[PDB]
UniProtKB/TrEMBL annotation, chains A, B, C, D, E:
<keyword id="KW-0472">Membrane</keyword>
<keyword id="KW-1071">Ligand-gated ion channel</keyword>
<keyword id="KW-0732">Signal</keyword>
<dbReference type="GO" id="GO:0042802">
    <property type="term" value="F:identical protein binding"/>
</dbReference>
<dbReference type="GO" id="GO:0005230">
    <property type="term" value="F:extracellular ligand-gated monoatomic ion channel activity"/>
</dbReference>
<keyword id="KW-0406">Ion transport</keyword>
<dbReference type="InterPro" id="IPR038050">
    <property type="entry name" value="Neuro_actylchol_rec"/>
</dbReference>
<keyword id="KW-0407">Ion channel</keyword>
<dbReference type="InterPro" id="IPR036719">
    <property type="entry name" value="Neuro-gated_channel_TM_sf"/>
</dbReference>
<dbReference type="InterPro" id="IPR006202">
    <property type="entry name" value="Neur_chan_lig-bd"/>
</dbReference>
<dbReference type="InterPro" id="IPR006201">
    <property type="entry name" value="Neur_channel"/>
</dbReference>
<keyword id="KW-1003">Cell membrane</keyword>
<feature type="transmembrane region" description="Helical">
    <location>
        <begin position="227"/>
        <end position="244"/>
    </location>
</feature>
<feature type="domain" description="Neurotransmitter-gated ion-channel ligand-binding">
    <location>
        <begin position="1"/>
        <end position="191"/>
    </location>
</feature>
<feature type="transmembrane region" description="Helical">
    <location>
        <begin position="293"/>
        <end position="309"/>
    </location>
</feature>
<dbReference type="GO" id="GO:0005886">
    <property type="term" value="C:plasma membrane"/>
</dbReference>
<dbReference type="GO" id="GO:0004888">
    <property type="term" value="F:transmembrane signaling receptor activity"/>
</dbReference>
Length: 309, 309, 309, 309, 309
């Protein structure tokens, strides 16, 4: 009894990740085929109906089922519409769309995270007793120049037809509450180049050269240099957070920065201590200089336990 | 006599809080059911009317009352509309919406604020003598990975149908001035993660380490260094202001920063004081040295009386 | 002859002031009542016609005159429309609007300026021989938590019906160049809180401690520290300009910064001077030290004639 | 043979110059008058048609020619449309518009540039054999409290009606390839106030005090300080470009900053030279000190011959 | 059998490249000519149908094939539409458009990159058995004062009609899967001035002057300065990244900055090494001074082999 509808989704561009909103843009076309009461067409050739005309055929009683992108955020930008009406009953709906879609996204592993871009498609009014998805095909471009792309799309789309029970329906009871839903998935990993070389590396180099505070010979030189190193971290904190995507949690890079702030406060506690440890007023040289290769290990080992995954 | 309307609101996403404008975005569906004069439907089965076709039934006189979101800011983006016409009189309105909504929002406890996301729903044209809200259902998705969300939704939505006296009317007098209104409330708190770890903590380390100025032994070392400390607070003031939400009042971090400005201006006053307090130019190294844990308590006390609540 | 129309304007939110464009947003409702040729209504009860149906009645020849917001910038976002048609002739137009409005805005005393939010309403086609405004009512909410509002609405709203002569007309001549215009005024003052505590004050502490450059005892110390003070000002300029509203002129704050810029250059010239004022190559430490209160007073005096308002 | 069209343009606001896009915003009204087939109006008084109704009259065969703003960027926001239909034949089209317009804009003398704001209006479909522009009237308010205005309008609008021959037309040949085009010009200059006091002047004070490095005593003092002077220029470059208009070229202010970078690199090149020029290792203070007026004049001499215009 | 369509594309402005999205905007006209069943026109002169009227003529069965821009991103803003209906059958569609287009864009050689802006035009429904592009003419303005333009368009546009096989179709079989496609390409190179003079050059000047650490005479001086130089580079990274285009990879300038980061970390390592390389702990001033001409040549040699393309 229920009508079988065949869907094909051609994906043109996935662009513009919104990190705070957990959304993304997808441009492509959607195709839908189903079969109805056969029809008299001008010539025994299939009939083509574009854009403003489809509305007219609907007023004469053509059944064109509303298919909703569930995880889209607000009505998508619809390009051209097409009905290809075959004389032998079958009907093809073809539409181009650009829409900003929503999905759960964990950005904690930035810049080395993998994400999956999803489309969720479901009919708006007719349940699986009325309209069901027979099959789903998703086609993607084959990207070869992905090294100039922000994201490396990682493997072909996965498809998934299932049924959804909306328990709370104000309608009827026997199975009038289940709807048939297509789900498209595309896996991807982030192109970590720019973030590796232009952010991670110099943060290391800076945190590195911070240790070279201990090879200054007076105390006065060492503590005062600590305040210029101090400022540099704040500056580097400002630099990253202004360019990196805003998020509600700490990333890898964010943590290196918290680590950089610690190492600098750490030295200030010691440099000030070594000036006062033992009697004689001795700048505990017994302590410093031994720190010239103590801290680069202390930071680098107690820093080797950031396995938050 | 009055028409009874039953409302169901499905909430999909509450995102994009706007601090300055006091708004937030809500994507969902809204459902309204009422019963009218029973009807001839094709088959004794309910009738489904999608989108552009609803306008047609209106011109032939189907009564579909406009229900307005009172606390929206501008006409919402409405996705698919749907009428389900049952033969036994009952009528179901189903429409998807995305809208920017307004409510009172206090951000003084940032990053530890609790908010109320609110919806207020009321008919646009018909009073409670004519149309009244019978009951209200609000459904919320269940967030399990809340550690990657901007906001933690805290408990299920509370609702309240109420009545409103509109004083200034051009209509008539006998009981023609009250309207039926749904009010949905959702409580939520901010995910304080990114801000404790990447803002509060280094502000402490910076504000703490400002104090290590008193462990320099020269006067020249002490006064000149605090000016490097001065630059560091403005840079940190600059960092915060660029990333934290724009507001028309001071937050806690805002106050700590001013305290940071004070702690350093205060210090410059003592350093200059202890050098000329006593006769002969003897540097009062009793005031200094006493300051080495005088300030870590004074600030830590005058900031421990930021109990403004 | 001319139709008297009674207007009521309900204001919900005045938000989103744009300083550079001198615009602001207003959300509210508008009511217009006038009386025409009496009508057949279903029941002796008034007829309610919403949204898409109003357009229909215009085509059957119903007169609904277009009332234009003079100072709106672009087509306002119209929410729900409603006609209330009375059997006794009279007609009530009700529509919700959100719109961006323009008015002259002087921001020179920022953050201590007062602005007035203005609405200017005038019919689009019909002069006052045809359509004139009988009376105008403006209703505004009671801001109770005004300490959490950015703008303090200061006294209830002002109203004023008037007539406007359009000299340059391509029409006729006979007093057909005058139009009936409602002009709503709302005065408001800026909540100067955030800017005092987080901008004016720390700028003071910074400008003040600039003066403590004269209590360094060396010439090298005094001269070299001022270059750091210099850096501290440029830094503070960047903090302010990036956060404060952008304008085509200098504000109060904009000037303080220029003063700090001056004072440091003033200090640099003295600090470099007292090193060469007297013969012997002796530092006129009479001059400096006089400066420990020449600048804190001199700057504070020739800068205390900042009665520029 | 051709229909004469008389145009009136009332300009309400010119705002929002986009420096990078070379565009500017214009709010106003446009009025076009022509004379046609005399007509029956209800009563012997002219007829008014508003908004949605103009379309209806177009369908019963009223000619209202589409007039295109040639240098607009994308379809403009048309507020109200109004048709005034005269019994003696004349037809007056009155429409309010807000649109983003384009013109070549050279911003190289910023902040001392003059721009001319242009409107170009031409019929979309009809040539000068068919439709021609009779006259163009442009009405502008006179902005007198121009001191809070970003731009000083250098007098009332100039116009130029001409004919434009389009080579590549797919139409017919004998004189059917020329179109009637109005060109409105408004001249204006930028108010250099804000940019003089808040950008030009403190850059001068800083570039000036940069020179006060030659008045430090040891070579260590002299060289170590210019690296802080260096940091200061970079801090100031950042301040400007983040607030000043975005462009594809160097401005005046841009160059001042390049000059400051030069002066400081120049001083370092000299400071290091005067230290090793002679044998004995003796400090060549003949070269230094002479530089105390070499740079303050050299920059001020080689910098007042920037007659690049 | 198939209809020949002759296309003309007039390009008005190419503006607003989005580096991240790999998009750019194009304003222009499109003209399409084909010949159909001849027609009786009012007078024996061609008929002009504008905008809303074209819509009407379609509903009575005028064939106007919808032509889609393949690589536009979202529904472009259609300006005026015009049908010119000739009596001898031919039909000309002319419409103005503004749209955002996508193409692969490689920005690695910034600011010296070349881009080609492409337009790809193809019918939405009709194959080359039904509709084909006969010829394509492309018209571009001649940029004469191109020195104020961000992009230099380099030569006339190249065009190419070709045919496209779509494999995955549910439609017909005998040659029914191929579509006709116009492809326009426009070459352009970037105006490298502003980025050369305001970014590359002062970056050189700073990276150079960084080297002058080796001419300070104390170890204390040389090392403490490296930390101030360190700060200057972080500042300069922030300035560039905030002003320059966002990309997913490192550019030439991004590389210069990493080099400055390296050179400074390089020196810190040597300065600290030269202090302990030799026995006695005496500063190996042999290594130093040799470094005064090691780095400007070493950096200039191993950095002139960044021919990475
Ligand atoms: F306040 C400062 F941080 O400003 C900039 Cl980044 C510095 F350090 F270069 F001066
Ligand atoms: F960074 C260096 F310039 O050192 C500190 Cl921040 C200054 F500016 F005070 F000199």
């Amino acid at each position: 009894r229920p009508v079988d509808v065949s869907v094909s989704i051609f994906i043109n561009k996935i662009y513009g990740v919104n990190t705070l909103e957990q959304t993304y843009k997808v441009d492509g076309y959607i195709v839908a085929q189903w079969t109805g009461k056969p029809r008299k067409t001008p010539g025994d050739k299939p009939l083509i109906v574009e854009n403003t005309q489809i509305e007219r055929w609907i007023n004469n009683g053509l059944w064109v089922p509303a298919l909703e992108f569930i995880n889209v955020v607000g009505s998508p930008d619809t390009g051209n519409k097409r009905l290809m009406l075959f004389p032998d009953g079958r009907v093809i709906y073809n539409a181009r769309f650009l829409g900003s879609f929503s999905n759960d996204m964990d950005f904690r592993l930035f810049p080395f995270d993998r994400q999956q871009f999803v489309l969720e498609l479901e009919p708006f009014s007719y349940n699986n007793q009325q309209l069901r998805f027979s099959d789903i095909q998703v086609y993607t471009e084959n990207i070869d120049n992905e090294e100039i792309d922000e994201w490396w799309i990682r493997g072909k789309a996965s498809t998934h037809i299932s049924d959804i029970r909306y328990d709370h329906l104000s309608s009827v009871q026997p199975n009038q509450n289940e709807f048939s839903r297509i789900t498209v998935r595309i896996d991807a990993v982030r192109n970590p180049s720019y973030y590796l070389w232009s952010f991670i590396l110099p943060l290391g180099l800076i945190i590195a050269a911070s240790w070279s505070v201990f090879w200054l010979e007076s105390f006065s030189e060492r503590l005062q240099t600590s305040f210029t190193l101090m400022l540099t971290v704040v500056a580097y904190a400002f630099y990253t957070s202004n360019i990196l995507p805003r998020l509600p949690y700490t990333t890898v890079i964010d943590q290196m920065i918290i680590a950089g702030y610690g190492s600098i406060f750490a030295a200030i506690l010691l440099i000030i201590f070594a000036h006062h440890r033992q009697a004689n007023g001795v700048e505990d040289d017994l302590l410093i200089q031994r720190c010239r290769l103590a801290f680069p290990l202390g930071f680098l080992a107690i820093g080797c336990v950031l396995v938050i995954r």
